[PDB]
Amino acid sequence: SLRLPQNPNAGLFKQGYNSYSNADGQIIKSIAAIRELHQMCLTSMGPCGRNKIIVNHLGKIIITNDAATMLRELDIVHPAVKVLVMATEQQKIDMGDGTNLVMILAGELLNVSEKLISMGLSAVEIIQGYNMARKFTLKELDEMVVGEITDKNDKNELLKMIKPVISSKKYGSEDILSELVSEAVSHVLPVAQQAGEIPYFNVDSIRVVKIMGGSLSNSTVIKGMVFNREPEGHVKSLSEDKKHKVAVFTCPLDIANTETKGTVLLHNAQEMLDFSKGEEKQIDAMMKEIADMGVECIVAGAGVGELALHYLNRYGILVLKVPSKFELRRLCRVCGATPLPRLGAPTPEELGLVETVKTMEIGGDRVTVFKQEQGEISRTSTIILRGATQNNLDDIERAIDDGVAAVKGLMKPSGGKLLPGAGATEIELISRITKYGERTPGLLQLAIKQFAVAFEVVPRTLAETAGLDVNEVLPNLYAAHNVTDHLYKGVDIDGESDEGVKDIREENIYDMLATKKFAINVATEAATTVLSIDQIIMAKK
Amino acid sequence: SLRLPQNPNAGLFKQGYNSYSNADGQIIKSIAAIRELHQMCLTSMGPCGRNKIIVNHLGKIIITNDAATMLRELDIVHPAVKVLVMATEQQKIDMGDGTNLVMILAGELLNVSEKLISMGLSAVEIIQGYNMARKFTLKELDEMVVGEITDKNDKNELLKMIKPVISSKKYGSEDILSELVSEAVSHVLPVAQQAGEIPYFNVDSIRVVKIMGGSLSNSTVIKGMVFNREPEGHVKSLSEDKKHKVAVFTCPLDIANTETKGTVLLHNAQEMLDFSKGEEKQIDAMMKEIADMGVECIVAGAGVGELALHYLNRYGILVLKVPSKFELRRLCRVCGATPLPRLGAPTPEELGLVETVKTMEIGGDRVTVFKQEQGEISRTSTIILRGATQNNLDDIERAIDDGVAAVKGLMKPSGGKLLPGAGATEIELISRITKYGERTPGLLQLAIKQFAVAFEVVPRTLAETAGLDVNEVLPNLYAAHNVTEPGAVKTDHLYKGVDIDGESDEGVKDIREENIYDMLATKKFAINVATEAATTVLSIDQIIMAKK
Amino acid sequence: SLQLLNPKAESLRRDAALKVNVTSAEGLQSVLETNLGPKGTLKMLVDGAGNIKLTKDGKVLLTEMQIQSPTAVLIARAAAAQDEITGDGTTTVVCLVGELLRQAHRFIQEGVHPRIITDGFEIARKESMKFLDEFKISKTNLSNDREFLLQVARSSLLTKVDADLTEVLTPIVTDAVLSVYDAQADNLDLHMVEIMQMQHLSPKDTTFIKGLVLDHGGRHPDMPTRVKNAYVLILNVSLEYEKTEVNSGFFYSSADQRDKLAASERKFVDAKLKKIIDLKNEVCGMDPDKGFVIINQKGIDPMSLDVFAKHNILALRRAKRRNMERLQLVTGGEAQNSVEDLSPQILGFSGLVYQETIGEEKFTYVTENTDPKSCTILIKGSTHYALAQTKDAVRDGLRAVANVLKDKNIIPGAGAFYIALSRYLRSANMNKLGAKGKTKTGIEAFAEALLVIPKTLVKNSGFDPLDVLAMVEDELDDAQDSDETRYVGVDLNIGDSCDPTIEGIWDSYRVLRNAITGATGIASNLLLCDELLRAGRS
Ligand SMILES: Nc1ncnc2c1ncn2[C@@H]1O[C@H](COP(=O)(O)OP(=O)(O)O)[C@@H](O)[C@H]1O
Ligand SMILES: Nc1ncnc2c1ncn2[C@@H]1O[C@H](COP(=O)(O)OP(=O)(O)O)[C@@H](O)[C@H]1O
Ligand SMILES: Nc1ncnc2c1ncn2[C@@H]1O[C@H](COP(=O)(O)OP(=O)(O)O)[C@@H](O)[C@H]1O
Ligand SMILES: [Mg+2]
Ligand SMILES: [Mg+2]
C-alpha cells in the first residue's frame, strides 16, 4: 500500500498528454482561472481605465489599455483563454472597435453561468438559451436607435462619432485629437454635392507619422505625408514654379540592364575610347526627354546611380528613394499619377500635380513634407503626432487606427447608426430580456435571466474606476428608468456624481450599432465554445 | 510501437520479484542449471576422481573430491541446485558415505526427465513412475546381497570395509592408509564377546590431529590423544613404572572466589599480617589431601593461578590446559575418570589410570602424549597424520571421518550385508528394472525404462575418468549379463565390473580377489534421497524469486 | 481539487479506481488460480537471504511476498484473517473476491449502480445462510466412526501433498484427534497438538508418539539414558545461582573466611535438593527397576547436575511454557512450584522413557502412558522447506478436521455446495424475496461467480471446463424428478461427475460460511469505492 498501480491505461497516450475532463471538474477549473485575466480587461475599461505595460520576449515595450494589443503578446499556456484571444483579434481586424467589451462580456457569461452549472442545469440547454437570447438581442437593438444619420460628410456631425471613441482612450485629450481625425476625414472624402453608391474607404488612407518631442497641442494636419529621409542635390524654390509634376518610377534611373548577368566586351581600343562617353550620352537621351516636359520631381524605388543623380542636380530635379513598396503607392495617390516601371517619356495624362515640397526639422531630424494647398486629393491624409515619449505615441496611433476603423465600419455598410452610451442601453437590455424570459415557459428560463445579469458589468465598471460605491449608483439608476427621457439615463463620472444622473446630450456620448452587434455575437460564440467543450487535451511543451 | 506496455499490473508485487513457470523451456533451463555443476561432479567420482580448488572470500581454501563438502562454500543462486546441496548434506550427516552418487543420480534422473517432459509425459505420472521404480529398486538390493562380516574385530575383514571407502578420497597407497584405521577401530570398540551386550560406537571417538612435516609412511596410531600444549612448571619423561594416577577437575585450580563482589577487608594490622600467609597455608592445605592420594598429573579446565602452581610442581604434579568443554570431556573417556568440580580429595574409584606422559618433538612444537599399553585398554584413540601440504591434511582427515562413518553402518543393522562394487550393483539393477517395466502395463513404462538408463552413469563415469573409451568398455560389459546356459551352475557373472587400470576389454577380474565392496545402508538412503531430490524438482512447475 | 491543495499527489477517480480494483483482483487471482485443487502446481519462495520454503498455502504466498497495490493488501488481510482462525479456505476467499468483482464490473459498464448491485449480494447471502441449514447433514459423535475421520483428513492432505505422504500422515492425525473427544467434549488444539522440527531419514518416516517428546536430554554421561518407570516432577524453581536484589559483597576478612562464605552458595541450592532427596526416600522401593526424572522450566546450575547424576536421577532443564502445561495431561500428575510442600500424589506415571541422539542434538522420548489426555505429532523431514511444507499441511489439516467435532454437521464439497447454490438462486421465485428494481443481475452475478471455482479445479487437470459440466447439469435435471436425493461431485482423474458421500471428499462448515461472509464484505466495499488517493506527511 505504498506505490499505486500507476493507472494501467499508461500504455495509452504519452505522459505529456494531460486530460482535464468534466465531472473531474474542468468547468470549475476554467471559469475560475480566467478570472485573473478578466480583471485585467475590467480594470482597463472605461475612460478612467488603467493601461497595462507588456514587455515581450524581444524587449519591445508597449503600453496599451485595450485587449487585442495586450493578448497578442501574452504567451498564454491555458488553451481556454486562447479562444477569447483570437476572438478579440477578429474584432480588431474587422471592425477595429470593441475589444474590451468583448473581453468583459465573453468572460462574464462564463462567470455568471457558475450558478447554472452548479445548480445542475444541462450544458446543452445553456447553449440553446444564449443562442435564442442572442437572436432577441439583435432584433431589439434596432428599436432603441435615435441617431439615424444620413449626411456623414460635415465635420461637426462627426463630434457625436469620433469624440466618444477618443474619449475612452486617454480621456483628457478630446478636442485636439478629434480635430486631427475629423479634419483628416474631411480631406479624405471628396468635395461633391452628393457622393453615394457606397464610396470606397480604407484604413490605409489615414497614416500616422510619429515625431519625437513637442506638446500634443502643437500638432497639425498634413494632406501629404512626412518621411524621415535626407534629400539630395539642391534646395527647393518653395514658391517659384507654383506647381510640380512628379513622376514615380518603379525601376531605378540607370541604363537598362537585363535580368541575366552580362559584362563588357571590347575587341579593340576604338570602343574603349567611346565607352566613357557612350554611357553619358545613353542616359542623356533618356534624361533630356524627362526635363523637356518639366518633371520637377522623380521618385525611384530602387537605388539610384550617381550618373543619373548627376544629370538631375544641374536641372534641379528632386530625388527620393522610398525603398518600401507599400508606402510607394500612397505618394502616387497624393499627386494623382500612376507607377511607371518603363522609362519611356513623361505624358501629361499619367503625370500628377503637386503644389510645393519643403524641407525642415520638426523634432530635430530633417524630413520631407509633401503638404499642398488648393490641390486635388483622393484618399490620403496624415496626422503628425508630437509627444514626450515614444511609448505614449504608440497608443495614440492605435487610438487613431480604431477611430478611422469606425469610419470604415460606418461607410462600408448601409448604416452605422448610433445608440445611447454611458451605461444607458445596457440596462435597457436587462429590462427587455427580463420581460422576455417570462413569455416562454420552460427549463431554459434560467439561462435567459442569467444572460441578462452578465450585462451588469458595463455600468459598475465605470463606477469602480470612478471610485464610487456600486451598491448606491447602480440601484439608484434603475429608479430613473421607471416610467423619451428614461432612455437617456447614464452613468456620471464626476465629483458631483452622488446623484448618479447625467444627461447624454450635454456631452454627446454615443456608441455604434454594428459594433455592439458584432461584439455580442463574437462574445456569445466565444462563451458558446468554452461551455460546449468538456475534455481538453494538452501535449508536451 | 516504439515501446511495449512493459507487463501491466506488475505493481501487484515488487519490481525485484520474478516468476518462473514451467513454460518457455524454463524446466529445461533448470535441468541445464543442474548440468553446469553436475559435469563438475563427473570428474570427481571414483578412485581416479580429481579434486577441486574452492577459494572463499576470506581466502580459506579446501581441496576436495567429494560433493557434500565442496557445495558448502559455493553460494548458489538457483534454488533447484540448492536441493542437491541439502540432499548431499543430509547424506553426509546421517551415513557419511555415498554423496557423489546422490548428486550423480539426482542429476541424471533430471537429465533423462528432459527427454520425458519433451515427449509429453505429465509431471504427476513421472513421480509415480520413479516411486514404483524405487519400491522395486530397494526390494532387489536386499535380494542380490552376498557376504557378511559376522565379527566386529578382525584384521582381514576390516581391509574389505575401509579400503573400498577411502579408495575414492585420496587413494595413494592402499596398505599404509588402511592399517591406520583398522588398528584404531579395534582400540575403541567394546569387544566383550560372549556376553550378550549391545554394541556401541561413537563417531567423535576417533579424531585426527593435523601435524605438518614428515611423510605419509611415518604416520603412527596413538592409543591416547595429543594436544599442542606446554607444561608450565617442568617437563618429565616419567621413566618411573608402577602406573601414575589421574585426577580431572573442571573448575580452575585456584581459590574459589565469591561470585558477588569478592573484595578484601582488613580492619587492623593483625589481619594484614595473617592475610598474606593465610592464602599460602590455605592453598597448601588443599594440595595435601590431593597429593597424598598419589596423583602426579591434573588436567585443568580453565586458567590456573601461580600460587596453586607453586605447590603442584613442588611434588612434581603435571598441569594440562583444556580451556573448552569438549576438549575436557574427550580426555575422561580415555582414562575413565569421573570429574568433580570440588577442590577436595579425588575419590580412589574415580581416579584414572595413565602409565606414561611423554613430551617429544614431532612438528617442531611442544606436544604432550598419553599413550596407554596393552593392559587396561582405552577408547577415543587418535591417529597422528603426517603430511607436507596442509590442504592434503584436510581431505585425508575427512576420509577418516568417512571411514569412521562406515564403521557406524555395522552397529545399527543386523550385520554387514556387503554388495559387489565397481559398477556391478548398478548394472545389475538395469536388467532387473528393465524386466520390471515389461511386466507392468500403462504409460508409466517409459518412466521405468528411463529410470534404468539413468543408472548407466556410474560405469560410464568410471570408464571416462580412467582414460578409456566408453563406447567400447560399456557394451563389452553388457555381454556378461546378456548371457545364458553357461556351464557352471553357481553363477559368477554378478561380480563383473569396470576396471580402472589394466587389462583390455575391462570387465574386471571380479571385484572378488580385489576385495572391494559397497554397503547396503549407503545404497538404501542414497537412492531414497536422490529420488527425493528429483521428485521435488520435477513436481514443482512454478518458481518465484526475489532481488535477482 | 487535489492538485492546488497538495503540490504533489496522485488521484484516480470514477473509471480508474474501478479498473484498478478489478485488474488487481484478476492479477492476484491468476497467481492463486493454478494452486487451487489437488493437481495444482507447487510454489517456492526464496528471498535475498537464499533460504527456501515450499508450500501451496495462499497465506504463505501473501504474507511473504511484499505487495504495493492498495486492493491486494485487503485481500491479503482477508485471506489471512479467514485462515488464521479457521485454518482452511484461503484461496477460496481470493477466488470469490477475484471473480465477484469482474463478474459485477461488466454490469457497471452497462450502467447499473454499485449500491443496488451490492444490495443484491447481501440479500443473496442471506439466502445461502438459509440454504446451509437444509444443505448440511447431521452426524452423531457417539458412534466414534474412525473411518469418517480418515476421509476428512484425506480431503486437505491430498490437496497439499501427494498420495505417498497422505497415506502415511493421515493416521498420524487420526490417532491424535481420536483422543481429543472426551466426556467434557471441550476441544483443545494448541495445547494438545504440537509440531516439532527434526532433520532425520525422510518425510515418509513420520510416526505418532502418544506422549510428550522433548528436544533435550541428559547432559552428563553417567546419568541414565533409558528408564522403565519414570515418575516425573514439575518444578518451576530455578536451581542455579541467583544474584539477590542489590546484595553485594561477601566482605571477607581472612583467607579462611573467604572460602567459608563461598560455601554458602551451595547451601541455598542444597536446601532445595534435600527436599528432592526426602521425596525420593518415600519412593525408594524398587529403585533399580523404577526411576525418577526432574523437568525444570528454568536453567539448572552445572554444579547441581552431579547431585542428580549420583542418585541416577534424570535431569532436563529449560523447558517451554507449553510443555509444562502438557505434562499433567500426559503423565497424569500435578504441577508444583515450591519445594516446601511435596506429596506422592502429584507425581505422574510413565511406562517407557528413552533418549536417542543424532549429531550434537539429543531428543528425549516419553510414551506408554496409562491414560494420556494429550499427545504429540513428531514430524520427520529432510530439508527445511520439507518441514515448512509439512508445517502448513499439518497446521491446515488439524484445524479442518477439528472443526467437524466442534459442531454436529459437515458440508460435502467437490463443487456440490457451489452448484447447488447456482440452481437455488437461478430458480427461486423472486416474489418471495424483498429485492426489486435493478436487483435482477445482482442475483445472477453472484450466482454465476460461484461456478468458476469448481472449474478452476478442472483447469489444473487440462480438460475442457465447460464440457465436463454438461452431464453434471443433465444429472441434476433428472435427479429432482427421479425422487432420489444425491449430491454430485467433480472427479479430476477421469473427467466425469462423482458422489462425495462415497469418495470421502468433505469440507468443514465454518469455512464456506466465513469465506462468503468475508468475501462479500470485501468485494462489496471495493465496488462502492470510486476514488483512490495518497496523501500524508513523510
Ligand atoms: N464623458 C463621459 N461620460 C459618460 N460616459 C463616457 C464618457 N466618456 C466615455 N464614456 C463611456 O465609456 C465607455 C468606454 O467604452 P469602450 O470600451 O471604449 O467602447 P468599445 O468597447 O466599443 O471600444 C463608452 O461606452 C462611453 O459610453
Ligand atoms: N579400485 C577400484 N576398482 C574398481 N572400482 C572401484 C575402485 N575403487 C572404487 N571403486 C568404485 O567406485 C565407486 C565410488 O564410490 P564413491 O561414491 O566415490 O564413494 P564415496 O561415497 O566414499 O565417495 C565405489 O562405489 C566403488 O564401487
Ligand atoms: N481430491 C479431491 N476431489 C475433489 N475435490 C477436491 C479434492 N481435494 C480438494 N478438493 C476441493 O478443493 C477445494 C479447496 O480445498 P482446500 O485446499 O482445503 O481449501 P483452499 O483451496 O481454500 O485452501 C474444496 O472445496 C474441495 O472440495
Ligand atoms: Mg472604443
Ligand atoms: Mg565410499
Ligand SMILES: [Mg+2]
Ligand atoms: Mg485447504
